[PDB]
Structure formats: C-alpha cells, structure tokens
Amino acid sequence: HHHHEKNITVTASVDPVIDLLQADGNALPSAVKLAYSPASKTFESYRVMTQVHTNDATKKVIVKLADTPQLTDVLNSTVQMPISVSWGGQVLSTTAKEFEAAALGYSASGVNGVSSSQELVISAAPKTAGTAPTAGNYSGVVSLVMTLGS
Amino acid sequence: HEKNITVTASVDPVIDLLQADGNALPSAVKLAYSPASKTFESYRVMTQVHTNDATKKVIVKLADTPQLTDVLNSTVQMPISVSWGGQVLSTTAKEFEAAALGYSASGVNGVSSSQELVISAAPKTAGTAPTAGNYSGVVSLVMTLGS
Amino acid sequence: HHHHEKNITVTASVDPVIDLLQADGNALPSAVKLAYSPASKTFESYRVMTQVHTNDATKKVIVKLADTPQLTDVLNSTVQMPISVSWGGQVLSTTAKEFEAAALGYSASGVNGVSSSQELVISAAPKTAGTAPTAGNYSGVVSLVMTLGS
C-alpha cells in the first residue's frame, strides 16, 4: 500500500594501474577538515592508514605533490599557512620520492599487488609559531601524484 | 565564534530502513577499486526495518537497474549489484515475510532483526581492468508494506 | 610512466581565541543527518563528545544559538519541526547560558587550555506533539555561538 523510495548515489574513481586506498578497503576521502586549537597553538593532523594497490609489484612507486600545499584564507589570498604531507614515514613534496617493493612490504600484506599499511599524514601550522593565525575559513588542496614505472 | 552544523532528515511515517546502530543510512557511498585484485570493495552495512506495522510483508525492489557510469563518457558503464537480507535485489521485487524479518527476536516493537545491505560493482568483463575515470550511479531502493 | 593524481581538499575554520573541537581532536562535522523511526515515532539524537580549546582557561564561556533551529521541509518552508540542542548538560537557546571555568574542568583535563569533555546533543521533534511528521526531506542549521566572558 505504502511505497517508500530511497536513492543512494554510488560513485567510484577508478585507476587501472595504481591507487592509494585506505587500509580498511575504503576510498580515501576527497575532503578533510583540520581543527586548530587555540590552546596548543597547533593543528590536529589528519592521519589515515593506507595501502598502495598496483597492477605490477615489480615496479617502483613514485610519489610527489603536484604543487606545494597551502591553507589559504578564502577571503584573502595573502593569508596562508603551510600544509605538510607525510606518507610511509617520508615527508612528501614537489620533489618526487621513490618507494621500492621491499620497503612497501608487498609480500607482508597477504594479497598480491597490495602494500603493507602506511600512514598518510596531512597537517598544517601557522607560518611563524608564536604568532596566532588570523581568524577565518581556510582552504587548500593536497595534490597527490603517484606513478608506477620502470 | 559561530559554528554551523547543517542538520537533515528524510522522514517516512510508515516504513524506513535505518542502520542497525540507529543512524540514518548515507545518501551516498563511494566504492574503491583495486588495480591489484581488479575488484571493487563492497559497501556493507547492517540495517533494520522500522515500520508502523510489523504484521505485514516487506517487498523490496530496485526502481531501475543500477550502473556506474563514467561521468564524462555515458557509453562506459559497469554493473552495480545490490543485496538485502541475504537476497540479490533486482527490478523484480522480492517478498520478505514478517516472520523471516525477525521482529519478535529484535525485542523492539516494529523494528526487524538486522539485515545486511550490500552495494557493489564489478568490471564489465572479469579479469580485465576498467578504463580510468570517475563514475557515478544511483541505487534506487523501493520498499513497500504488503496489504 | 603512469601517473595518478588524487586531490584532497583540506579546510580549516580557525579561531585564535576559542573553539569547540571533538574530544578526540577532530573538527566538528559540518553536517549531521537525523534518522526518523516510524516504529518509535522519534528522531534519533546525534550525540558527540566535545572539548573547549581556549587561549585563556580562566574565563567563563558563554554559549547560545544564533537562531532557533528548525528542521524545515525543503519543499515547504511552513512545515518546521523544532530542533533541540544541549551542550555540557544544558539546553541551549538564543538566550545565552554561561559556563564557569571551574565547572568546565580545565584543571581536570590533562591539557592546558582544554576543558573536560562535554556532550553536544542535537535532536528534533514533530511539528505537533503526538502526531507523526509528514513524509519529506527536511533541512536546517544549528548555529552555535561561543565567546569568553569574565
């Protein structure tokens, strides 16, 4: 008699060669929010455990940021705070870092092609410590580029 | 210091499917594809029927056959599959008897025992990777109370 | 080689003086969805554990709502279900309530400038008490305003 409808939008970003997924099998979120503490004068970092999945485990995994990430006041371009990104214990930047199979622990993981868990950390700090940031809403993009080759 | 929290709700006063933990189901899910295993990680959540009448059957169908479609290329699609209460769902409705849904084992009036909801997808051809891109689709659940 | 770009938008709402974070450090969510049960005829309350982070732990904290929050039918603005908000064991309102420093347990927390944890509860009720709500999609905003007193 009564008809109830429920629409759930399903999405996927597919890469056939390489991707970085959460260690729990989920997709990484497209957006994260960092909290700033007026008490500790620091941001609470975003930390997530991830695994690289690849279609060839004989190749090297190369990781770099497409650009230097910044939190920028959405009302004032001039007002910025740097973002720091670490993955698998390595500070990432615009200069590429190479990760070899042994170091990614492919054999350890237990499914072929998939790395051991590595932590991804995204965080931020004010440009100069001691000086509190200016109030506002801030935005930026961590552009993670990862390549397979050799 | 202003802090804004948007709060929403979708209300059905006769029947709804909620999470088994009491939360609402999400309006959207994101599925991860692994280039290593060539498969998608399924979305799995335990659910309960909440209903104004627990003596009726619950009939469940999909309004349309769900697909993941390349946002930039309509011609490139992958099938989505949906399971509920241990049954593969389709455009043809499945009937769940009131007794099967375990209302008397739940211990809460009008709340069914838990039933797993599974959404997943697979490449069009098994063992062959799909093409790179961003894909999207709707699972359109239709549930009715029998008379 | 093959390159896969993955862009993660990072945002922050920065307040230098005072802010309310989740008790685990993360930012509060920007949105919550309340379930309505046709079985119990109630909305499930959203509850989250929170801490005040402040640059002065000696000051009273004043908390109010900017407007009386409503769950309003997105198709009909005249169908409003009242939203109720409590924080730290107090029902909040557009009329301010004050929380003394001593009461917020800054000195019981392990951390300078961080209060003891305080529960935030958001819930709602039907437009007319004792009568089920009409089917629809509803939306509203809980605007929380918090300043330091004396």
**Can you give the residue ranges of every domain in chain A?**
1-150
| Residue C56 to residue C43: CA distance in whole angstroms | 37
Taking contacts as CB-CB distances below 8 angstroms, the residues of chain B near A13 are: 30, 33, 133-135
| Residue A106 to residue A112: CA distance in whole angstroms | 7
C100 Cα distance to chain centroid:
19
Cα dihedral across residues C36, C120, B4, C72: positive or negative: positive
C139 φ/ψ angles, rounded to the nearest 5 degrees: -150, 150
Strand partners, C6: A144
Q: Which residues of B touch C (CB under 8 A)?
A: 1-16, 18-19, 22-24, 26-27, 50-52, 54, 108-111
DSSP string of B2-47, one letter each residue: EEEEEEEEEE-SSEEEEETTSPPPPSEEE--EETTTTEEPPEEEEE
Tokens of residue C104, six digits: 């917020």
Q: How many CA atoms lie within 13 A of C148 on its CB side?
A: 17
Are the beta carbons of B142 and B62 closer than 8 angstroms?
Answer: yes
C30 Cα distance to chain centroid:
9
CA angle B47, B142, B136 (to 5 degrees): 85
Distance (Å) from the C-alpha of residue C87 to the closest C-alpha of chain B?
13
Specify the residue for token string 């960092």.
A34
A12–B121 CB contact, under 8 Å: yes
CB-based contacts of B75: which residues, under 8 Å, 6+ apart?
none
Are the beta carbons of C54 and C28 closer than 8 angstroms?
Answer: no
| A1-150 fold | Immunoglobulin-like (2.60.40)
CA angle B19, B22, B26 (to 5 degrees): 45
| Residue A54 to residue A61: CA distance in whole angstroms | 9
C11–A19 CB contact, under 8 Å: no
Q: What is the dihedral of CA C133, C134, C136, C137, to 10 degrees?
A: -30
C80-104 burial, b for 16+ CB within 10 Å, e for fewer?
A: bbebbbbbbeeebeeeeeebebeeb
Closest residue by Cα to residue A85 from A146, A5, A2, A14: A146
A127-148 burial, b for 16+ CB within 10 Å, e for fewer?
A: eeeeeebeebebebbbbbbbbb
Tokens of residue C143, six digits: 């605007």
Taking contacts as CB-CB distances below 8 angstroms, the residues of chain B near A17 are: 35, 129, 132
Strand partners, B119: B43, B82
Mutation target among A34, A46, A68, A87 for the C interface, most CBs of C within 10 A: A34
The secondary structure of residue B97, as a DSSP letter, is -
CA distances C150 to B10, C89, C94, C144, Å, are 42, 21, 20, 20
The second-level CATH assignment, the architecture, of B1-147 is Sandwich (2.60)
CB-based contacts of C37: which residues, under 8 Å, 6+ apart?
B16, B18, B50, B111, C43, C44
A110: left (phi over 0), alpha (psi -120 to 50) or beta: left
Q: Say how many residues make up chain C.
A: 150
